[PDB]
Amino acid sequence: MTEYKLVVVGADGVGKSALTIQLIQNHFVDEYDPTIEDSYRKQVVIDGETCLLDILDTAGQDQYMRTAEGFLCVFAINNTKSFEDIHHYREQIKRVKDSEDVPMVLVGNKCDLPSRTVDTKQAQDLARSYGIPFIETSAKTRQGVDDAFYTLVREIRKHKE
Amino acid sequence: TEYKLVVVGADGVGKSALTIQLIQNHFVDEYDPTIEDSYRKQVVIDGETCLLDILDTAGQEEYSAMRDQYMRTAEGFLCVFAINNTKSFEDIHHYREQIKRVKDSEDVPMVLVGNKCDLPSRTVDTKQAQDLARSYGIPFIETSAKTRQGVDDAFYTLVREIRKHKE
């Protein structure tokens, strides 16, 4: 069965662990140790194809990063600094993958929050700069959560051929 | 405000890991199964600074200067099973019944905890526990001592049940 190796990267506190646990256990985790980096597997159905998602939830202190096929690059919309940090993440990815075409999705998490400091336009301009999709999500409400992971899986499928 | 909390449950469910996690904010891999002790922590709950005193049970077959006077002063109980341990779950009724008797009451502030929710080998599903917890009319919270998931939720919910019971 087709196993996808997905990595979630981003500044700490943007919701990398909440996003993953949401997809895995379908619950919003209020508290999750920021230091715990781990892999989680889930069988999903994406476009009528069943597959196994292997997700590395990074805590950012390399079997996975060498075999990884797709990246979620996560900022929080209430956290300008995390957004500023995105370029750092993009650059590390292009290196660990020695390529300029790595399947990648820009994720703006915490979209249930009213205190936005990063607008959709800013992030679409970044995502267009990279030529990747932008998806707005909330780990707490499930907004765009499947869309983010499934859009990455769809990017991988294009890249495989 | 001091809250006197007791953690009860079968051997191996993570009573000591849960407590140490709340107290010292780290996951203890090994803790002597036989050590029953009280741990104090100043926390802020709902804007209220409060001293949480926690009696971590080990089913002491010896003397415990605390449980002797703890069970007489105790205000709130965590009833802990592990989700990968059907037997520990089956044991919950035993614990609930023993509590009502040591406290000679039908209204003891109490929370049902399903620990080691980080494990994929679950033998007790959310519904079974919510049905047990509803039978007792208490909250169910799923936790992992290892990831901190729901740990503050469990303890803070118990403190909130106590506050309701006090008035």
Ligand SMILES: Nc1nc2c(ncn2[C@@H]2O[C@H](COP(=O)(O)OP(=O)(O)O)[C@@H](O)[C@H]2O)c(=O)[nH]1
């Ligand atoms: N309101 C809200 N809080 C979120 C969201 N995602 C994560 N959080 C919270 O933000 C905090 C940090 O998230 P966490 O997943 O631990 O961050 P990480 O370092 O990227 O793994 C926690 O208190 C989460 O519950 C979200 O979409 N909405």
Ligand SMILES: Nc1nc2c(ncn2[C@@H]2O[C@H](COP(=O)(O)OP(=O)(O)O)[C@@H](O)[C@H]2O)c(=O)[nH]1
């Ligand atoms: N995976 C997992 N293991 C846990 C968790 N809590 C405790 N453990 C382990 O389970 C065992 C029993 O935990 P302990 O706190 O000593 O249990 P007690 O006998 O109820 O006091 C130890 O190996 C702990 O490391 C948890 O949340 N997740």
Ligand SMILES: [Cl-]
């Ligand atoms: Cl690097």
Ligand SMILES: [Cl-]
């Ligand atoms: Cl496209």
Ligand SMILES: [Mg+2]
């Ligand atoms: Mg995390």
Ligand SMILES: [Mg+2]
């Ligand atoms: Mg113990």
Ligand code: NA
């Ligand atoms: Na077991």
